Amino acid sequence: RFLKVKNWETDVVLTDTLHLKSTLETGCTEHICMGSIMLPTKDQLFPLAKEFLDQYYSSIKRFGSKAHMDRLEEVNKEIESTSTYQLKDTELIYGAKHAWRNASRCVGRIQWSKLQVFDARDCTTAHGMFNYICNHVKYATNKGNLRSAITIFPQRTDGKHDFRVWNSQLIRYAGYKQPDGSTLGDPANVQFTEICIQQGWKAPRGRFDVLPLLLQANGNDPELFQIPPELVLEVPIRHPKFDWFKDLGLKWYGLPAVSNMLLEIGGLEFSACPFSGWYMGTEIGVRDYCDNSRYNILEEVAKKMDLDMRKTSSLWKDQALVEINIAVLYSFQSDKVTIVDHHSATESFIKHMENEYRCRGGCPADWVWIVPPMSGSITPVFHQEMLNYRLTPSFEYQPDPWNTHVW
Amino acid sequence: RFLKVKNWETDVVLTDTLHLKSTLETGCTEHICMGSIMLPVRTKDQLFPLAKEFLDQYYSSIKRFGSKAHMDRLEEVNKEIESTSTYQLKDTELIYGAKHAWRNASRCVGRIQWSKLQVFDARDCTTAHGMFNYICNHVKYATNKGNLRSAITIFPQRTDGKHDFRVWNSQLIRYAGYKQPDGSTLGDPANVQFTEICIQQGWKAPRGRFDVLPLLLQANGNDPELFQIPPELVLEVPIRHPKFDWFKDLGLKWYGLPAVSNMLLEIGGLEFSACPFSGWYMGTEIGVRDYCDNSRYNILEEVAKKMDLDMRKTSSLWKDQALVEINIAVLYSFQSDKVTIVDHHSATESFIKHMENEYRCRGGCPADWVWIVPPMSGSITPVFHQEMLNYRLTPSFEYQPDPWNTHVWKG
Numbered sequence: 001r002f003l004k005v006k007n008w009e010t011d012v013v014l015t016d017t018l019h020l021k022s023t024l025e026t027g028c029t030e031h032i033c034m035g036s037i038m039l040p041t042k043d044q045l046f047p048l049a050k051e052f053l054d055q056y057y058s059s060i061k062r063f064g065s066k067a068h069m070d071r072l073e074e075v076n077k078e079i080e081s082t083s084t085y086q087l088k089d090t091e092l093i094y095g096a097k098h099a100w101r102n103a104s105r106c107v108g109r110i111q112w113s114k115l116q117v118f119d120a121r122d123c124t125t126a127h128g129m130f131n132y133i134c135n136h137v138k139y140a141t142n143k144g145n146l147r148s149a150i151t152i153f154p155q156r157t158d159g160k161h162d163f164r165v166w167n168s169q170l171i172r173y174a175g176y177k178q179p180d181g182s183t184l185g186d187p188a189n190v191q192f193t194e195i196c197i198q199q200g201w202k203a204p205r206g207r208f209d210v211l212p213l214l215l216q217a218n219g220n221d222p223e224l225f226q227i228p229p230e231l232v233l234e235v236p237i238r239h240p241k242f243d244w245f246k247d248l249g250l251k252w253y254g255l256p257a258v259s260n261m262l263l264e265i266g267g268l269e270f271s272a273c274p275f276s277g278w279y280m281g282t283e284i285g286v287r288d289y290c291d292n293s294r295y296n297i298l299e300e301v302a303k304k305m306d307l308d309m310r311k312t313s314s315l316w317k318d319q320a321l322v323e324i325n326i327a328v329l330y331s332f333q334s335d336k337v338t339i340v341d342h343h344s345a346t347e348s349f350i351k352h353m354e355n356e357y358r359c360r361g362g363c364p365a366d367w368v369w370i371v372p373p374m375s376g377s378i379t380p381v382f383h384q385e386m387l388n389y390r391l392t393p394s395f396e397y398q399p400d401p402w403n404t405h406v407w
Numbered sequence: 408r409f410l411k412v413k414n415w416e417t418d419v420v421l422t423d424t425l426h427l428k429s430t431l432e433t434g435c436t437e438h439i440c441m442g443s444i445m446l447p448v449r450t451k452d453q454l455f456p457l458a459k460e461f462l463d464q465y466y467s468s469i470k471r472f473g474s475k476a477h478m479d480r481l482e483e484v485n486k487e488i489e490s491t492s493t494y495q496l497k498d499t500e501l502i503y504g505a506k507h508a509w510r511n512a513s514r515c516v517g518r519i520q521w522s523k524l525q526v527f528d529a530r531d532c533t534t535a536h537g538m539f540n541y542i543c544n545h546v547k548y549a550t551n552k553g554n555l556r557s558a559i560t561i562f563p564q565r566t567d568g569k570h571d572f573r574v575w576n577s578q579l580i581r582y583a584g585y586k587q588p589d590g591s592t593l594g595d596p597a598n599v600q601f602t603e604i605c606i607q608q609g610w611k612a613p614r615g616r617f618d619v620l621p622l623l624l625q626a627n628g629n630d631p632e633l634f635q636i637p638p639e640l641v642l643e644v645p646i647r648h649p650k651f652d653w654f655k656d657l658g659l660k661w662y663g664l665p666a667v668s669n670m671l672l673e674i675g676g677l678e679f680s681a682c683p684f685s686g687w688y689m690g691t692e693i694g695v696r697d698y699c700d701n702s703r704y705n706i707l708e709e710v711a712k713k714m715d716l717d718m719r720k721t722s723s724l725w726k727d728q729a730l731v732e733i734n735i736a737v738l739y740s741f742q743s744d745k746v747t748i749v750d751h752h753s754a755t756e757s758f759i760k761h762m763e764n765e766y767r768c769r770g771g772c773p774a775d776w777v778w779i780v781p782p783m784s785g786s787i788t789p790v791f792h793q794e795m796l797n798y799r800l801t802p803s804f805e806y807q808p809d810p811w812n813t814h815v816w817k818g
């Protein structure tokens with residue numbers, strides 16, 4: 001089963017064979033495409049473990065070897081006895097790197113093999129989780145020279161003793177509903193902020209308040225911890241040409257760190273596995289600042305620019321959007337904090353995709369997420385056909401724990 | 408059976424039931440999504456079910472389902488197919504069918520307009536000369552001195568597949584492209600292959616940057632024939648910028664009338680291989696796609712040079728800055744010349760209102776996010792955070808391969 005993908009700018013055609021190794025289901029059918037939908041026992045466990053160990057032993061050119069058979073033997077016995085198994089450190093590192101390699105929504109995967117993996121499987125308490133996370137934040141931040149990292153807490157057992165980070169990202173800003181009816185801070189985080197306050201957090205009640213961590217160890221009720229302020233690197237936003245831009249009082253944090261996803265390796269499930277990289281500029285300047293449901297700053301910026309806001313066809317929104325994104329990139333670069341613009345990032349992804357087709361037989365990719373949220377067609381991913389399918393090991397979305405947890 | 412779609416900016420949730428009427432396949436499976444793949448004679452047996460499905464839909468839309476007239480029409484079509492292997496649509500059914508192919512076109516952001524379509528019935532056409540006259544009349548009507556009106560012209564349907572009507576042009580109005588011995592291209596690189604065919608057939612090429620191509624028209628399966636659209640029927644707009652006086656000296660212009668001529672219209676199992684249709688432009692089609700695609704006019708560098716932007720590093724966003732100014736110029740120029748055009752903000756806002764109305768009155772609105780989201784400033788338009796469901800309803804417009812690959816040359 002050879003599927004062709006074409007690039008419409010270059011006419012280059014690539015052949016995908018990797019999709020034949022896909023296992024999980026997409027949500028699409030022959031009758032309906034759901035490509036734009038955001039959320040589309042012992043017996044079960046051994047085939048999953050075997051599938052993974054086969055791929056691992058193949059990667060180190062030891063497939064069918066004594067060491068391969070012996071390990072498969074070992075894992076089988078462990079599952080039959082304990083209803084589960086433990087990954088070797090080599091297997092854990094390989095699995096985490098491949099989960100990133102397989103993440104079809106990630107434009108940054110050229111970097112996949114350079115991931116620092118912190119093994120936190122010996123963690124037993126919420127205070128232990130906090131220490132691990134602080135060390136991750138410090139290592140990853142590296143005074144502005146950011147380094148990709150993942151920290152992996154103990155795997156799910158019976159499902160009643162899950163480790164979870166309640167926060168969606170390790171560093172994010174609070175949001176507060178006002179008597180005015182408006183929102184102060186980040187509207188994305190109003191609900192989580194309320195939970196934090198209810199659990200005892202003393203909120204500063206400002207526009208950019210770094211949220212505390214709510215950490216759940218061993219299925220216990222989550223506990224609150226504040227990340228040491230001096231470990232949270234932030235960048236004030238200014239513009240190279242517009243002196244007034246600084247007076248908007250905008251800032252953002254340097255470290256993008258996802259903490260709400262589930263890492264599946266060899267059928268084992270790691271429900272707390274925070275990971276971090278560095279930002280693409282549009283993530284801050286387009287998504288976080290300009291989404292209507294977020295800080296929604298387009299109107300204020302346009303006003304300061306003296307643009308004709310009376311008609312849409314003046315393209316005042318597009319003009320202000322460009323300037324905000326110029327300011328984001330300028331500010332991070334001036335403060336020596338790693339950032340990538342959308343042109344550079346997409347160029348790198350195409351090179352990565354070409355590498356993956358030649359060395360691996362394909363690269364699953366979700367065009368809806370890969371194409372940047374501004375200036376899509378002038379980047380080299382827009383005219384690139386992509387095939388989206390699910391490979392394991394993988395990162396999977398999991399719902400907010402406050403919808404499931406029983407106190 | 409219900410599917411839900413969510414808008415991630417507004418939290419508005421809609422419910423689709425219309426997908427139940429979908430027939431044809433998407434290209435996707437349970438194991439693979441092909442959502443970003445651009446390209447993912449019937450027998451008596453298969454035709455009557457297709458005819459019946461269409462006629463049932465038509466008579467339902469006029470509130471005459473199950474009426475004597477409905478039953479009589481089914482009988483009449485049944486007997487026509489069994490006797491002649493095909494059938495003819497009534498004028499009313501043709502109009503309904505063409506409007507619905509547009510309503511159903513999942514890649515079209517302009518569908519709020521679907522019920523306002525002028526249908527020109529050209530099923531009595533027999534020759535390429537006849538096709539040319541119908542096409543000129545379509546261009547003149549649709550252009551309407553700048554007050555653009557949507558229109559479609561429908562030529563005779565397929566019979567045995569050996570007698571097809573085809574417009575060989577991909578669009579009625581488009582510019583020539585010429586590859587030079589040094590490997591550079593003059594004009595529009597999208598049209599080099601078609602231009603060579605025109606020259607080979609006898610066109611005398613001006614060899615400039617914006618030469619309107621001749622029509623190459625195939626009637627009744629015969630070899631195609633060349634015709635020049637009268638220049639006075641081809642409305643064009645020189646591109647200038649409201650603040651930058653040097654913009655005009657880039658020498659840019661574009662034509663006012665976007666008119667697709669290469670698609671197949673399917674109505675009730677019948678196939679109309681020549682059915683040119685036209686509307687009016689969304690600004691980004693010209694300013695982003697036609698001007699800025701690397702494989703097209705590719706003007707970004709030249710514009711950025713004249714703006715004196717910092718072009719040493721991509722992080723200055725020089726390309727983004729130049730792109731906005733080009734698109735401002737396109738909208739300004741069309742508006743100044745009183746030629747209908749819509750900006751991407753207005754167009755997407757109207758589409759979302761159309762979509763919500765369709766969910767309420769029809770139970771759905773199939774839409775292809777990849778094409779619906781504009782090629783610049785996507786996330787600041789209301790379509791970006793809208794979940795969509797893509798599925799195929801008939802009547803429909805389908806892509807067909809370029810006829811120069813398939814045509815049997817008679818001589």
Ligand code: HEM
Pocket residue numbers: 100103105106107108109111115148149150258275276277278279280283287340345369395397
């Ligand atoms: C090294 C720099 C990195 C860059 C520039 C980057 C870039 C991005 C971007 C731009 C997105 C989508 C955000 C949006 O569309 O608004 C994304 C998503 C994602 N990335 Fe990366 N990435 C990086 C590192 C990582 C790392 C280290 C991992 C895991 C080890 C990872 C895994 C993921 C996953 C799982 C998603 C989807 C997240 C979700 O579903 O919410 N990426 N990436």
Ligand code: HEM
Pocket residue numbers: 505509512514515516517518520524557558559667684685686687688689692696749754778804806
């Ligand atoms: C009236 C104003 C109209 C506007 C503003 C408009 C807008 C557009 C746009 C922007 C595209 C996609 C182009 C791109 O992604 O670069 C498109 C595609 C399309 N539209 Fe419309 N449209 C209009 C009228 C029409 C009419 C009259 C019809 C047919 C009766 C039609 C049927 C289609 C079809 C079939 C496609 C897909 C074409 C393909 O696959 O090549 N549209 N429309």
Ligand SMILES: Cc1cc(N)nc(CCc2cncc(CCc3cc(C)cc(N)n3)c2)c1
Pocket residue numbers: 038039256257258275276277278279280283397
């Ligand atoms: C409903 C829903 C589903 C889903 N799968 N993801 C989300 C969150 C999407 C999301 C929002 N902001 C931020 C991110 C993280 C993206 C990200 C992650 C990393 C590691 C690096 C980098 N530069 N960027 C992801 C929401």
Ligand SMILES: Cc1cc(N)nc(CCc2cncc(CCc3cc(C)cc(N)n3)c2)c1
Pocket residue numbers: 287291293368369370371372373415416791792
């Ligand atoms: C839980 C939740 C609720 C809510 N109302 N919104 C969100 C954020 C939704 C969201 C908005 N913009 C951007 C993203 C990132 C993912 C993303 C999505 C799409 C469609 C394109 C693209 N390039 N990237 C996510 C999350």
Ligand SMILES: Cc1cc(N)nc(CCc2cncc(CCc3cc(C)cc(N)n3)c2)c1
Pocket residue numbers: 445446665666667684685686687688689692806
């Ligand atoms: C390989 C391929 C497949 C496919 N389905 N379409 C194409 C052509 C895409 C395409 C390119 N330029 C222009 C259009 C026309 C879109 C269009 C059509 C109409 C009627 C009005 C309007 N404003 N815009 C379509 C190519």
Ligand SMILES: Cc1cc(N)nc(CCc2cncc(CCc3cc(C)cc(N)n3)c2)c1
Pocket residue numbers: 008009011382383696700702777778779780781782
């Ligand atoms: C026959 C043919 C060959 C070729 N190399 N390119 C083309 C045009 C491909 C093309 C390029 N940009 C734009 C389009 C329009 C359709 C389109 C495609 C996508 C991916 C997004 C979007 N918003 N709209 C089509 C056609």
Ligand SMILES: [Cl-]
Pocket residue numbers: 286287291373786
């Ligand atoms: Cl966004």
Ligand SMILES: [Cl-]
Pocket residue numbers: 377695696700782
């Ligand atoms: Cl484009």
Ligand SMILES: [Zn+2]
Pocket residue numbers: 028029032033034035435439440441442
């Ligand atoms: Zn799909």
Ligand SMILES: [Zn+2]
Pocket residue numbers: 287291786792
């Ligand atoms: Zn967004």
Ligand SMILES: [Zn+2]
Pocket residue numbers: 377383696700
């Ligand atoms: Zn393009």
